[PDB]
Every structure is written in structure tokens, then in C-alpha cells.
Coordinates of C-alpha atoms in Angstrom, one line a residue:
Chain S
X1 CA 122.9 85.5 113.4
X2 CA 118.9 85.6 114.0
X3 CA 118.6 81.4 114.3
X4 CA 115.2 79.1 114.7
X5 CA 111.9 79.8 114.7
X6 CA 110.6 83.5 113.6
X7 CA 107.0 83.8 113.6
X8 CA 105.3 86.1 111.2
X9 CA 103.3 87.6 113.7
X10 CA 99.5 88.7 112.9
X11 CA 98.8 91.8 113.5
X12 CA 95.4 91.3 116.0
X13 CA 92.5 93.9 115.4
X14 CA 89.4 94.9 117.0
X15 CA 85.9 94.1 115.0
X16 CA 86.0 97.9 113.5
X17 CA 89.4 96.7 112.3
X18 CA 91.4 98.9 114.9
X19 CA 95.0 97.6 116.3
X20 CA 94.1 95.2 119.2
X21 CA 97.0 96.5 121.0
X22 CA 95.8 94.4 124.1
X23 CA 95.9 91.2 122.5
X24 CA 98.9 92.2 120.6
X25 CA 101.2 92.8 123.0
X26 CA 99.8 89.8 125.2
X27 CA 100.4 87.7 122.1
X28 CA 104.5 88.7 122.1
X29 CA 104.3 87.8 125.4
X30 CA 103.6 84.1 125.0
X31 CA 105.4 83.7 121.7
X32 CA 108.6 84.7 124.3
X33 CA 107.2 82.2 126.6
X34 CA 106.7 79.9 124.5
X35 CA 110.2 79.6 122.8
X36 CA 109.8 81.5 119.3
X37 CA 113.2 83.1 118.8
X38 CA 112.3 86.1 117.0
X39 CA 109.4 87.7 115.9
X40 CA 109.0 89.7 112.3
X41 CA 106.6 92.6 113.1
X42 CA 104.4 93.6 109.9
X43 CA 105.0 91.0 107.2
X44 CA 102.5 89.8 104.9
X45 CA 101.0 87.5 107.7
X46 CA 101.2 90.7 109.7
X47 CA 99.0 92.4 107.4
X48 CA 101.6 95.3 105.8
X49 CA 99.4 95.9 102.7
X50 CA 96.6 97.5 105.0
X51 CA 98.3 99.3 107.9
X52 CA 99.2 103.0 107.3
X53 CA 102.7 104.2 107.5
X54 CA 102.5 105.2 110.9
X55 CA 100.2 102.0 111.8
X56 CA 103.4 99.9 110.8
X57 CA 105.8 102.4 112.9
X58 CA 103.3 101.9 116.3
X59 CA 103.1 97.6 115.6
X60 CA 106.8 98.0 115.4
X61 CA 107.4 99.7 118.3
X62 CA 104.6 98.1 120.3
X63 CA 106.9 94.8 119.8
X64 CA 110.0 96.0 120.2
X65 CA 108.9 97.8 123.7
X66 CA 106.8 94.3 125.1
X67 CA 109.8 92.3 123.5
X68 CA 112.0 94.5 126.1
X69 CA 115.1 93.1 124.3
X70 CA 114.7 89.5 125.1
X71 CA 114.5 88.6 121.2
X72 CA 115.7 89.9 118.3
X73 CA 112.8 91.7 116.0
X74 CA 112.8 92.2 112.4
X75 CA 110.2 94.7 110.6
X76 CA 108.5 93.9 107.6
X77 CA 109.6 97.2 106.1
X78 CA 108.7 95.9 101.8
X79 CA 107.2 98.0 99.5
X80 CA 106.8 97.8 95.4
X81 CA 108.6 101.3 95.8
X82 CA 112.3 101.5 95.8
X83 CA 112.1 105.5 98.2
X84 CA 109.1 103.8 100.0
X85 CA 111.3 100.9 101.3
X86 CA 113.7 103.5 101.9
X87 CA 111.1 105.3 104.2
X88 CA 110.1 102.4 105.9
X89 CA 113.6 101.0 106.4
X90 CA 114.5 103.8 107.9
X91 CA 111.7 104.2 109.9
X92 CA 112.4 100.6 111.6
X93 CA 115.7 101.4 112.1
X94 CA 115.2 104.3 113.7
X95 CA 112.6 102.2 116.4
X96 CA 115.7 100.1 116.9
X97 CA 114.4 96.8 115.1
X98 CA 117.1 94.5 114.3
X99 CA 117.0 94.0 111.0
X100 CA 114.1 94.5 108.4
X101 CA 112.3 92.2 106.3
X102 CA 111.8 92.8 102.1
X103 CA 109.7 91.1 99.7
X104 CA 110.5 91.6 96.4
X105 CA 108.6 94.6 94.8
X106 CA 105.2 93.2 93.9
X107 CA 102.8 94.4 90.9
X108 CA 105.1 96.2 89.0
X109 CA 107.4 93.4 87.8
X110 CA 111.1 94.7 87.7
X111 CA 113.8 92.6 86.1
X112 CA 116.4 90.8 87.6
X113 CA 119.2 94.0 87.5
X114 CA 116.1 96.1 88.8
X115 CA 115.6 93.5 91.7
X116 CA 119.3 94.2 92.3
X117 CA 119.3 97.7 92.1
X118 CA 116.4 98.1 94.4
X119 CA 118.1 96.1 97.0
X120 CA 121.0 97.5 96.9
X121 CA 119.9 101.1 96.6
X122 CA 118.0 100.1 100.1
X123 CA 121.7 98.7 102.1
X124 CA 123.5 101.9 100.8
X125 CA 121.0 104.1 102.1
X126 CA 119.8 102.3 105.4
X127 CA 122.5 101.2 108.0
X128 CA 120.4 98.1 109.4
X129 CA 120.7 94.1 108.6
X130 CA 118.1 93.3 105.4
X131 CA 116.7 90.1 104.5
X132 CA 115.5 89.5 100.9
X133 CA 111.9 88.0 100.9
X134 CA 111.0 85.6 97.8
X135 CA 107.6 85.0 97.4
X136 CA 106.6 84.8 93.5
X137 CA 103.4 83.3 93.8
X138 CA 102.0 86.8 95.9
X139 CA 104.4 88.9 93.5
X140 CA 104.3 88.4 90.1
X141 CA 108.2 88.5 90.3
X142 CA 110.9 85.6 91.0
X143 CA 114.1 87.1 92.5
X144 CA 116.7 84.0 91.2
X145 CA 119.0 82.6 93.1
X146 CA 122.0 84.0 90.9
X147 CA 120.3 87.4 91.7
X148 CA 120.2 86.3 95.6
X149 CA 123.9 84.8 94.8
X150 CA 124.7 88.5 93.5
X151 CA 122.9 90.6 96.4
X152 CA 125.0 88.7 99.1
X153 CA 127.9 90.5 98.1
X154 CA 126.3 93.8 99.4
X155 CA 126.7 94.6 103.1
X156 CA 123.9 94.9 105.0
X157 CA 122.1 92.3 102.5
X158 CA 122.2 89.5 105.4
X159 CA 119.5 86.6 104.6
X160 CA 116.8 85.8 102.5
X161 CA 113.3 84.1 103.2
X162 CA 112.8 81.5 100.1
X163 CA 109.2 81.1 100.0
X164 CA 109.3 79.0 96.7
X165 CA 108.4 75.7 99.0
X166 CA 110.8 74.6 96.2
X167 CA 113.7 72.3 98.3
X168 CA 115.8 71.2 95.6
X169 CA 116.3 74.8 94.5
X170 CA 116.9 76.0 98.1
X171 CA 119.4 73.4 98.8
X172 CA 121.1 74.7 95.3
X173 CA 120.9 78.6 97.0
X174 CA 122.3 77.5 100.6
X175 CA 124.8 75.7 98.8
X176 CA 125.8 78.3 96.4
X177 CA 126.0 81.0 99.0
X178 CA 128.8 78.9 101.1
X179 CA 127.9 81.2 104.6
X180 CA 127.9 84.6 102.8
X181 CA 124.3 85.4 103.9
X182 CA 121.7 83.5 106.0
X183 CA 118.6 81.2 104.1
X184 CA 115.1 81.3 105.8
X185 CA 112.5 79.2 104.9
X186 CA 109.5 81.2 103.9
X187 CA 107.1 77.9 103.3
X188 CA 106.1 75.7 106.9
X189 CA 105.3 72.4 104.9
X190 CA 108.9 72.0 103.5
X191 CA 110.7 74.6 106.5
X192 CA 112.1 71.3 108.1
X193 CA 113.7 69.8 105.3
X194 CA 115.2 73.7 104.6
X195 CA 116.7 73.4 107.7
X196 CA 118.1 70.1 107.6
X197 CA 119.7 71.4 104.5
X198 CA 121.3 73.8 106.3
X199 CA 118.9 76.8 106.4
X200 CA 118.8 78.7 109.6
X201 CA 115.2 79.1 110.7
X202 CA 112.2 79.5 109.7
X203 CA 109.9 82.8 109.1
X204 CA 106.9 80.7 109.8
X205 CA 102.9 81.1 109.6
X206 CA 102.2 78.1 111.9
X207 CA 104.5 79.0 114.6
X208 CA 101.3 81.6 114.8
X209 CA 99.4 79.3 117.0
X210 CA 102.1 76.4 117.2
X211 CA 105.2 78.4 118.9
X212 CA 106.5 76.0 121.3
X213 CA 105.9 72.8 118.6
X214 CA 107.7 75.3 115.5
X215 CA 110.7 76.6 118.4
X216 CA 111.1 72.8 118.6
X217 CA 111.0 71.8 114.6
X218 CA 113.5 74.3 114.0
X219 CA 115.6 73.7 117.4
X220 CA 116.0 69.7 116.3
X221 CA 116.2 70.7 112.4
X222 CA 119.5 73.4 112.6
X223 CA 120.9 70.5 114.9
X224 CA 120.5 68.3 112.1
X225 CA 118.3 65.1 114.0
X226 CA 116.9 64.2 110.6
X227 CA 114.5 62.1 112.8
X228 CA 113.4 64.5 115.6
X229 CA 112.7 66.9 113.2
X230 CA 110.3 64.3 110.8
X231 CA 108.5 63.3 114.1
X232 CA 108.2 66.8 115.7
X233 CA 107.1 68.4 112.4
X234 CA 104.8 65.3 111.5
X235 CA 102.6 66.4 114.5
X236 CA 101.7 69.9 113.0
X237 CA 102.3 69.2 109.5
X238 CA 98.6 69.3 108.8
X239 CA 98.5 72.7 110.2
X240 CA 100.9 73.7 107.7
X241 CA 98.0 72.9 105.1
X242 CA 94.8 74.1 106.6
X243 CA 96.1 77.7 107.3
X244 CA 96.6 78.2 103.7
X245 CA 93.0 76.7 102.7
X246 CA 92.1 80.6 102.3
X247 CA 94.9 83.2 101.5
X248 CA 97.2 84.0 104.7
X249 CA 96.7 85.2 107.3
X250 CA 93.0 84.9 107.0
X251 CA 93.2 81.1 108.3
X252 CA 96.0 82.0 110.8
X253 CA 94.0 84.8 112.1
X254 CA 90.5 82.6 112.5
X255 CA 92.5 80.1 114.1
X256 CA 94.1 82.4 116.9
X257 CA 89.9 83.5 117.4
X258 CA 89.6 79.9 117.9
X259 CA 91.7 79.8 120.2
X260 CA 90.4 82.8 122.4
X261 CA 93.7 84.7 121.9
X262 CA 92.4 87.7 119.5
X263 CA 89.3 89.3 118.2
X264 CA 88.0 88.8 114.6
X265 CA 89.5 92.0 113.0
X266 CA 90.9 91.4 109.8
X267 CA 90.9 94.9 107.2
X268 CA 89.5 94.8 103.4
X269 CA 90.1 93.2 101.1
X270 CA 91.2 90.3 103.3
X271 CA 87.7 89.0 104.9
X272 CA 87.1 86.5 107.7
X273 CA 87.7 83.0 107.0
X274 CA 84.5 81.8 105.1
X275 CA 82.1 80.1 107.2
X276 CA 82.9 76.6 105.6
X277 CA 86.3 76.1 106.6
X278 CA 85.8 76.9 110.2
X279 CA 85.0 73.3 111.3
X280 CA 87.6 72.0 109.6
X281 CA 90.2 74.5 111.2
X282 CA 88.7 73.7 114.8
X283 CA 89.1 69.8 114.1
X284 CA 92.8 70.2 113.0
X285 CA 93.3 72.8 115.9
X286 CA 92.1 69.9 118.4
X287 CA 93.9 67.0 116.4
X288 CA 97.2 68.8 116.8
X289 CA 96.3 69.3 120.5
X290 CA 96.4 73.5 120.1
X291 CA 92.7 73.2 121.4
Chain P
X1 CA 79.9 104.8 76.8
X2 CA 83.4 105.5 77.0
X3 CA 85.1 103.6 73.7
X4 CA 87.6 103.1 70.9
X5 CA 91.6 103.0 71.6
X6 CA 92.3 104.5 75.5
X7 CA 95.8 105.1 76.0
X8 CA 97.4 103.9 79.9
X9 CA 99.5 106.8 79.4
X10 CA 103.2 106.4 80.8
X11 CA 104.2 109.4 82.8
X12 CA 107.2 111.3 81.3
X13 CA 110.3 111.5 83.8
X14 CA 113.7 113.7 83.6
X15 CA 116.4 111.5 84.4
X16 CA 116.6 111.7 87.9
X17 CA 113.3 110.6 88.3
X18 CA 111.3 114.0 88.4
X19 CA 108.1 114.1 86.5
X20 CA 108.7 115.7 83.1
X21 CA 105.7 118.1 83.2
X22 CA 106.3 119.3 79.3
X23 CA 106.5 116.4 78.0
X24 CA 103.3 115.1 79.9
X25 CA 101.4 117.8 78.8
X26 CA 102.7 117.7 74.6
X27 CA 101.8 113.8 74.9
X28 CA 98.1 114.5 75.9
X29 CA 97.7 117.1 73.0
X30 CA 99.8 114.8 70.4
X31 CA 97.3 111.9 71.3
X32 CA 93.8 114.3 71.3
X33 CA 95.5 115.4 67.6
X34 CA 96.3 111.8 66.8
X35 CA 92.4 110.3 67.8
X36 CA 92.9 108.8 70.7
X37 CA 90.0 108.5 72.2
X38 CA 90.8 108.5 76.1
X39 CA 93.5 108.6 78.2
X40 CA 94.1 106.7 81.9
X41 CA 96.2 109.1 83.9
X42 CA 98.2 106.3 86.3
X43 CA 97.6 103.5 85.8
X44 CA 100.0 100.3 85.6
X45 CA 101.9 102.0 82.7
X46 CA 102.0 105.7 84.0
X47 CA 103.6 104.0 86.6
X48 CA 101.3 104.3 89.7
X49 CA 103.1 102.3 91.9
X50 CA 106.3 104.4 92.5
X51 CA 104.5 108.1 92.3
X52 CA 103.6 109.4 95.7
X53 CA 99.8 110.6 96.4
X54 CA 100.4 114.4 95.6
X55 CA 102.0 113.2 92.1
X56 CA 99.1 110.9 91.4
X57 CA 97.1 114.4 92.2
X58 CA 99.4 116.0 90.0
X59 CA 99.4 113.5 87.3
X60 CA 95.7 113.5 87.4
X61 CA 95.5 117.5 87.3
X62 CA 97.7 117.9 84.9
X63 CA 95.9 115.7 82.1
X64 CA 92.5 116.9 82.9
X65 CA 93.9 120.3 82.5
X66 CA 95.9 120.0 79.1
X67 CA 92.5 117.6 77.7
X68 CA 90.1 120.8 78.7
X69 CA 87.3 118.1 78.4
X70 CA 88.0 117.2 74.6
X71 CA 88.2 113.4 75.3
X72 CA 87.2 111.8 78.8
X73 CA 89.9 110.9 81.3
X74 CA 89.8 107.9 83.4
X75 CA 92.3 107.9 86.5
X76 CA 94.4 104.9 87.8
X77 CA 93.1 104.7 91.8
X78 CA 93.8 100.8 92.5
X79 CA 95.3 100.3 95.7
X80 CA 95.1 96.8 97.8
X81 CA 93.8 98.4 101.1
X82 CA 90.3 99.0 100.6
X83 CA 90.5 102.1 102.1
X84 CA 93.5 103.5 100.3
X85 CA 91.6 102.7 97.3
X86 CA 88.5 104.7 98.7
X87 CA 91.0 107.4 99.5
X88 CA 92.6 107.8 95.6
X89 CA 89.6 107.6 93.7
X90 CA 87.8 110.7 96.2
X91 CA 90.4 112.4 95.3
X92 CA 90.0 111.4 91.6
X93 CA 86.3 112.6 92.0
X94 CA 87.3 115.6 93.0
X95 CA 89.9 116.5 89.9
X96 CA 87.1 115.9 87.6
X97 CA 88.2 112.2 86.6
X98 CA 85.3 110.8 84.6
X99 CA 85.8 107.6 85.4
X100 CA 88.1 105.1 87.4
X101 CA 90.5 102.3 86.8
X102 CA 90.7 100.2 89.8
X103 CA 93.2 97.1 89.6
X104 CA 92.5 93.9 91.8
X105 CA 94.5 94.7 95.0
X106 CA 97.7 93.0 94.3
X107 CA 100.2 90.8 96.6
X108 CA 97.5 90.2 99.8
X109 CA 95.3 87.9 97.2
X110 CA 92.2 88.1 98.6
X111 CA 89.4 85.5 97.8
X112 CA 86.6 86.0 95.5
X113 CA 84.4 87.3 98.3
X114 CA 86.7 89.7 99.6
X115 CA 87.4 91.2 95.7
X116 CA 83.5 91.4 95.7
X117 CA 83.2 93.7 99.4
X118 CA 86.4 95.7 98.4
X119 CA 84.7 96.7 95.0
X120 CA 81.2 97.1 96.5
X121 CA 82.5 99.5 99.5
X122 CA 84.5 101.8 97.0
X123 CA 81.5 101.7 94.3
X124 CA 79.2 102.7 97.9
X125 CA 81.6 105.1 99.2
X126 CA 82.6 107.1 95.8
X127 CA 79.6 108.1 93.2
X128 CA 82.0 108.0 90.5
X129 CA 81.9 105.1 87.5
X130 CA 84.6 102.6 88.1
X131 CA 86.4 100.3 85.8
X132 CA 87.2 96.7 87.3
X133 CA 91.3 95.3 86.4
X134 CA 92.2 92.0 86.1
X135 CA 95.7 91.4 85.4
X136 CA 96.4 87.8 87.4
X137 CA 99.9 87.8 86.3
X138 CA 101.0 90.9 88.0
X139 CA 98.6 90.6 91.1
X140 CA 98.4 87.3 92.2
X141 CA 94.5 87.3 92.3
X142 CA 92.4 86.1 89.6
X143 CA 88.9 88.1 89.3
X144 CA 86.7 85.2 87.9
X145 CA 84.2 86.0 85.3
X146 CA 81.7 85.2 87.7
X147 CA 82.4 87.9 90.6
X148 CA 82.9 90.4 87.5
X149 CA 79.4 89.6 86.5
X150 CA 78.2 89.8 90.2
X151 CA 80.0 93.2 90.4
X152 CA 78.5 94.4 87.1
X153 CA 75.6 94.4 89.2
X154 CA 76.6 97.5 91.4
X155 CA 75.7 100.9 89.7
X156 CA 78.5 102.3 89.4
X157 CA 80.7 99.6 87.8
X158 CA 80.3 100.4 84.6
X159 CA 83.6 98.1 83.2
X160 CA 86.3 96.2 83.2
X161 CA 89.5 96.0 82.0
X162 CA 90.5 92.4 81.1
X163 CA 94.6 92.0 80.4
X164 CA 93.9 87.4 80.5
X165 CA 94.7 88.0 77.0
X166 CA 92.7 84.8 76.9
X167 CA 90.1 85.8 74.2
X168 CA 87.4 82.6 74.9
X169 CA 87.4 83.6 78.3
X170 CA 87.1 87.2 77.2
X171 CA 83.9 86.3 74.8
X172 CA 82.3 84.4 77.8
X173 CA 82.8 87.5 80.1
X174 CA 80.8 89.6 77.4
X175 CA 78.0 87.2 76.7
X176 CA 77.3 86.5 80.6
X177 CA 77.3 90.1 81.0
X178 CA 75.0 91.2 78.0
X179 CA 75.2 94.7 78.5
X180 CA 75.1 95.2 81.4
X181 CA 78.8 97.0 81.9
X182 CA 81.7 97.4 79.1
X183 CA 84.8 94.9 78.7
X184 CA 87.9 96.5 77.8
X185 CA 90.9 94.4 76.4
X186 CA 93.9 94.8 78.8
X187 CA 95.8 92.8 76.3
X188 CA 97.2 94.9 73.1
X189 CA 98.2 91.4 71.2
X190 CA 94.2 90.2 70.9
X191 CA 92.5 93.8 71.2
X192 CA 91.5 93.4 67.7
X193 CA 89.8 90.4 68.3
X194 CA 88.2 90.9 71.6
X195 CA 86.4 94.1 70.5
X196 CA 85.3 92.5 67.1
X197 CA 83.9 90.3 69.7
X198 CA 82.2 92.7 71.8
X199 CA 84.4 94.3 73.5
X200 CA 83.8 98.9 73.9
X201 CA 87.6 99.7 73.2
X202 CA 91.4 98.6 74.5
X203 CA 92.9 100.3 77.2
X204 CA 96.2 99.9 75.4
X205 CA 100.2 100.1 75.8
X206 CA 100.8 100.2 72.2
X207 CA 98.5 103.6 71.5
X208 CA 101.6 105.2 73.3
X209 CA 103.3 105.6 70.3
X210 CA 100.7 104.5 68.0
X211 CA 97.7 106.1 68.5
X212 CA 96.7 107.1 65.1
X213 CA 97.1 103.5 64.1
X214 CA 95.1 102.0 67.5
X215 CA 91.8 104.6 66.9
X216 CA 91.4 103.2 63.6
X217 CA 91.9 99.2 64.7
X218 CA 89.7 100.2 67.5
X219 CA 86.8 101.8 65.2
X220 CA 86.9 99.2 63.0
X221 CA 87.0 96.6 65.3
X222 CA 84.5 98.2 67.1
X223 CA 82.0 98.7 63.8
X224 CA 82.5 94.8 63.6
X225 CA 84.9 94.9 60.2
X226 CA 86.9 92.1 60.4
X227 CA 89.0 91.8 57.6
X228 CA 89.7 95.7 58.2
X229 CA 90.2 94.9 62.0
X230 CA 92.8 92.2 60.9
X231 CA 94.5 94.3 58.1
X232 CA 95.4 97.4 60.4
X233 CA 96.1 95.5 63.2
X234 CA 98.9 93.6 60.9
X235 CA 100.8 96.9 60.5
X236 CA 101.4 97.4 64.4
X237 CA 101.0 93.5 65.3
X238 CA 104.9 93.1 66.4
X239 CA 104.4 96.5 68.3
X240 CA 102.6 94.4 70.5
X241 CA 105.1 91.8 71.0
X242 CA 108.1 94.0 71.5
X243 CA 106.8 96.2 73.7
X244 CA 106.4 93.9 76.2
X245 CA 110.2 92.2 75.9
X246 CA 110.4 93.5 79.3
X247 CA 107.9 94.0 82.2
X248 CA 105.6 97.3 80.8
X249 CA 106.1 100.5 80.7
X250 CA 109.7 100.3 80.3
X251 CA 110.4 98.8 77.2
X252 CA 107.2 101.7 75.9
X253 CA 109.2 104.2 77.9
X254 CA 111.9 104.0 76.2
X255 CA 110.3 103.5 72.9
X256 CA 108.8 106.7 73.3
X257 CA 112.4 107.8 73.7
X258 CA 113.5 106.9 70.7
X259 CA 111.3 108.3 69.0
X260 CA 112.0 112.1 71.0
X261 CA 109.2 112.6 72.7
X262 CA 110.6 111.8 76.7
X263 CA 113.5 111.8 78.5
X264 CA 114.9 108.7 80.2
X265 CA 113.5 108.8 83.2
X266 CA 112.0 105.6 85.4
X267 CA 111.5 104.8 88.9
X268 CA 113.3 102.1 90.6
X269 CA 112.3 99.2 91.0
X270 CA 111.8 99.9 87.0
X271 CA 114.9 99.8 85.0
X272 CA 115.7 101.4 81.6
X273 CA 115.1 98.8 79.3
X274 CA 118.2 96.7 78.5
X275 CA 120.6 97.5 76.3
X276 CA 119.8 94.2 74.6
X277 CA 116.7 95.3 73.6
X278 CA 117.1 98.8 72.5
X279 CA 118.1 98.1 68.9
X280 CA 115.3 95.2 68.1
X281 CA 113.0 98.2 69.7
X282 CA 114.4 100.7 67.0
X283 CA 114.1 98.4 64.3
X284 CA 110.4 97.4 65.1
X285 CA 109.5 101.2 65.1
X286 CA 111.6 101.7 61.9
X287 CA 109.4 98.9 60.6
X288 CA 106.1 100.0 61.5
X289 CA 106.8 103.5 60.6
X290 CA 107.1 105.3 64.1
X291 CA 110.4 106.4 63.1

């Protein structure tokens, strides 16, 4: 179902750190304008680890409300806690998100079966679409894609964002799966070759300050134009490297400042992108035409 | 100051999860007996990360209680909000903690910088001594040696906890420092070594259910014996190994189960170790003479 491009929205924030709620809920209007298709509300690029409980219930619901139902939204709902995804699953649910978004339990490490268990403890106690969220590299933990293969089976369990930037491997998941549950791309440098391959959109960092050029990547990618989609991605593809030169979102977040779209809020331990790479963020910014 | 073998103590849990309060409180007094020199109440192996705040409290209370200020207790209060750590390890203050154990936020990696500002603002906020954790593998962050150093700067940093297992890198940490704070081994396997290198103790998995055997490889280690270092550590070297045949605590969970001391509880995302295991486990402690 959910298709195209799905932004990881930041989550803006005044210079005490505060919710911009402001700039927030201007920002959801453009990204409809724009063309993003959907919008995940308090992912990773959204700033989860930071926000309170009841911070990630009022971003939630702030989106949902400016969204007013003309795109779908998921909630970043992940926690290394089986009952505190529960919580939070619920919790979006309840503020009528559309489905929920779920890294992999970080820190802690579980196997494989306890990857599985969480998961499906989660669908059987939450009555709301869930996509899986692989991202090994931030988690200490890589769900497989015989685990994925295995959680597809569940109901409820109906995607998963593959952040391995690993294409071979995705192709093999997409290809193992046969339909049985959607694949995201979790990585903007490889999402359009993902999508080519059959994935169905992509949860994307760039689409932060590039909606309209990402709506069109993944718009010309799910139709399978191998072409449009190498010459339409081409023209961002260096953005796709220079908001990762510091840990996300602190590039994506310095970028929209650039851009006069949100304050410079950003909470501890995440800092403000380091004075160094701020030139070179403007330069590809203006080279990509966004400024 | 605080040296010698210091035990991450798991926390005992009945089968449906509960916290086994009798067995918590029988461990403490079995290690105090046995020579362990400290415990840390929460951390990575009492399973922090799927215990609520009151049952950190809890957990806390309870150990500081049942030790009666015999041996010092250090609490678990990493978090990867700045101000969630602040938050625990106030409230670790207040119990009567004597010290701190503070993991590198996890998942959000932030950048040296930002590791630097998130330990500085809990060191200014807190007058409590804190212990620095670096455990890349789980957390997605490395702490270099050089922003430990820089921290060891701050008053009241009086450690770190270094799980590299990388013991060069360990020995270079302890000569830029020269004094100035204590490095604790995080990695059971090259304790031994690290403290016959320097190092003021191991905060160890292993002293869980060897903790006789750990004080002495500690003190000796510690007193710079190295053939005696080697030649205890030999008894309870594939201890080491084993316990780690799946992500820690569970495979220690469960070897503390075997030997009748807790019930089988664990919290999901953990898992029971695997069946697979459980005999090799037996045989190891059979071996070293646990059971």
C-alpha cells in the first residue's frame, strides 16, 4: 500500500531545544505541496531517541492533524524494549497514524528468534500495519532477511525499511518475499536502484530538503524508467552524501537552517553540524539548485 | 579508588518477567561473602534497557540496601538523551549510589564533540563520580581515547569502562591518562592483562558466577603478578568465551540458572539462551568447577 517517496521528517526545534511547532507543521505543509507521499513522524531522522513519550505522541498528532488526511502517516514508534514498543505502538494507533515504524531493538543485541519474538509480540498486541526497520550500523543488531522472510508471515507485519545500502542483498529479500510484505529503502544513495528492483519507496533523509526531486526519483523508479530515474537521482545524488558527512539528522537539520525553513535546535547528544562542514553543505545545497 | 573484580550484576527475574526480589537480594550477599569487591546495579548485564524507571529505583534500592555499605555500589544511569541520562543518575545520587556507570548514548551516534558536551552537562549537573562506557559494538559510537582523555579532565569523571577488548589500545588509554581517572576492562577475555597493565579492576560478566575466582585474578593482577594473573585466569579462561555464545546477559542468566541460584526469567527482546547452548554451558561450569 503506502508507495513513493516517505520522508523521515526532522523534528524542528527552537534554540532551547523546544518543539518548533511553527516550523513543523509549516514544514508538512510543503512536503504535501511538494509531492512527498507520506511522511514518517519521529524516526531516527526525527529525533525519537530525545523526545519524551508524550513529546513523540504531540509530533504525531501535530502531523496527523496539519496532514488533515491528504497522506498517509507512519509513527516511528521503535524502542530497544519489547512493552515500550508496545506502549508506543499503541499510542500511535490510538492518534490514528497509519501504520508505525520499528527499528530493530538497538543496544541490547537480541538474537535472531528474539528479533522475531519482539516483532511478533508487537502485531499480536497492536491492531495497526508495522514496518520492520533494518539499520545495523546504528544497532548493533542485523535482522536477516530469512528473519524478515519469517516475520512476513505475521499479520500486521506489512514492510520493512532495509537500510543495509546493501542492493544485491535487497534484491535477494524483495525477491524472496514474492509480494508478501512491502521493501523500503532505508539508504538514499542506492534507494533508486531499490526501487528499480522492485522496492516500493523510499523512507528517505534527502527528501528532507529535496521533496519534489525524491517524489520524482521514486515516482520514475516504481515505474521502472531505468533511465529517468539515473538522471533524476544523478541531480541530488551528492546530497545523498553530504547529509551523512556528520551523523543524521545533524546535516539534514543544518541544511533545512540553510535554507531558512527551521531554527537550529537540535537536543544532546546530537550537536549542530560542526562549523567546518557548513560551507560545504551550502555549496552542494546551491549546486543541486535547493538554494 | 574503587578496584579489584566489580560484578555488572544481572537482575534476577521469575518467569514472567517479574523481578525476583529474593534472589536479587541472596546474590548481593553470596558475592560480599565470595570477595567481590563491587557491584553495578543496572547496567548492560542487569538488563537496563528493558526495566522501567521505578525498577531501575528499585534495583538500585534494593542492592544498596542488602550491601549496608560493606562494598561500594556503582549504578547503571546511561541513557542516549542527555537529559534522561541527567534524570537517572539524580536519582542514583539520591539512593546513595557511590558512583555511576554511564554508557555512550547508543543508536543516535553522536560525534566526538557531542559525547564530549553530553558527558560534561551530566558531570556539571550531578556531583556524583561517573564512570565513562565504551562498548562500540553494542552502541554504534566509538569514544576515542582522545575525548576519554579530554573527559578525564572534568572532576567528576573519575573512570572508564573500556569493553574494545583491544588491549594496545587499552595500554595507550592508560598511559595518555597517567592518573588522572581509572580504566576499567569491559572485556572479561583480556581483564587479566589489561589490569596487569594498569588497569584499577574489571567490571566483569564472568564474576556472576565466579566471583571468588575473579577477586583473586583481579588482586593479583592488580599487585602486578603475572605469572599468578595468568595461572588463575587459566581456570575460568573458557568462562569467558562461553558466556558470551550469545549476546550477554543471557547466556550468564541462564548460567546462573543452572547453577540454582535464579529463575528463568528475561525480558524480550532477550531470549533464554538456546537450547543449543545450554549443554556446552553446563559442561563449561562442570569444568571450571561452578557445578
Amino acid at each position: 500500500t503506502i508507495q513513493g517517496s516517505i520522508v523521515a521528517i526532522v523534528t524542528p526545534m527552537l534554540k532551547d531545544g523546544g518543539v518548533d511547532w511553527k516550523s513543523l507543521e509549516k514544514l508538512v505543509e510543503w512536503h504535501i505541496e511538494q509531492g512527498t507521499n507520506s511522511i514518517v513522524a519521529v524516526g531516527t531522522t526525527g529525533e525519537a531517541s530525545t523526545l519524551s513519550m508524550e513529546e513523540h505522541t504531540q509530533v504525531i498528532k501535530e502531523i496527523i492533524r496539519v496532514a488533515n488526511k491528504r497522506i498517509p502517516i507512519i509513527a516511528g514508534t521503535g524502542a530497544n524494549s519489547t512493552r515500550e514498543a508496545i506502549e508506543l505502538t499503541k499510542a500511535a494507533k490510538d492518534l490514528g497514524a497509519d501504520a508505525a515504524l520499528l527499528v530493530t531493538p538497538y543496544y541490547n543485541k537480541p538474537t535472531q528468534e528474539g528479533l522475531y519474538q519482539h516483532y511478533k509480540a508487537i502485531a499480536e498486541a497492536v491492531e495497526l500495519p508495522l514496518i520492520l526497520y533494518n539499520v545495523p550500523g546504528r544497532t548493533g543488531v542485523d535482522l536477516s532477511n530469512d528473519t524478515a522472510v519469517r516475520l512476513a508471515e505475521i499479520p500486521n507485519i506489512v514492510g520493512i525499511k532495509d537500510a543495509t545500502g546493501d542492493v544485491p542483498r535487497g534484491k535477494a529479500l524483495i525477491d524472496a518475499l514474492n509480494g508478501k510484505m512491502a521493501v523500503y529503502s532505508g539508504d538514499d544513495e542506492t534507494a533508486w536502484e531499490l526501487m528499480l528492483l522492485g522496492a516500493d519507496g523510499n523512507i528517505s533523509v534527502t527528501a528532507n530538503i529535496a521533496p519534489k526531486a525524491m517524489s520524482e526519483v521514486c515516482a520514475v523508479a516504481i515505474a521502472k524508467d531505468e533511465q529517468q530515474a539515473k538522471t533524476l537521482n544523478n541531480k541530488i545524488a551528492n546530497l545523498h552524501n553530504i547529509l551523512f558527512c556528520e551523523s543524521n539528522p545533524i546535516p539534514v537539520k543544518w541544511a533545512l537552517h540553510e535554507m531558512g525553513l527551521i531554527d537550529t535546535g537540535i537536543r544532546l547528544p546530537l550537536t549542530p553540524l560542526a562549523e567546518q562542514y557548513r560551507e560545504p553543505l551550502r555549496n552542494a545545497l546551491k549546486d543541486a539548485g535547493i538554494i
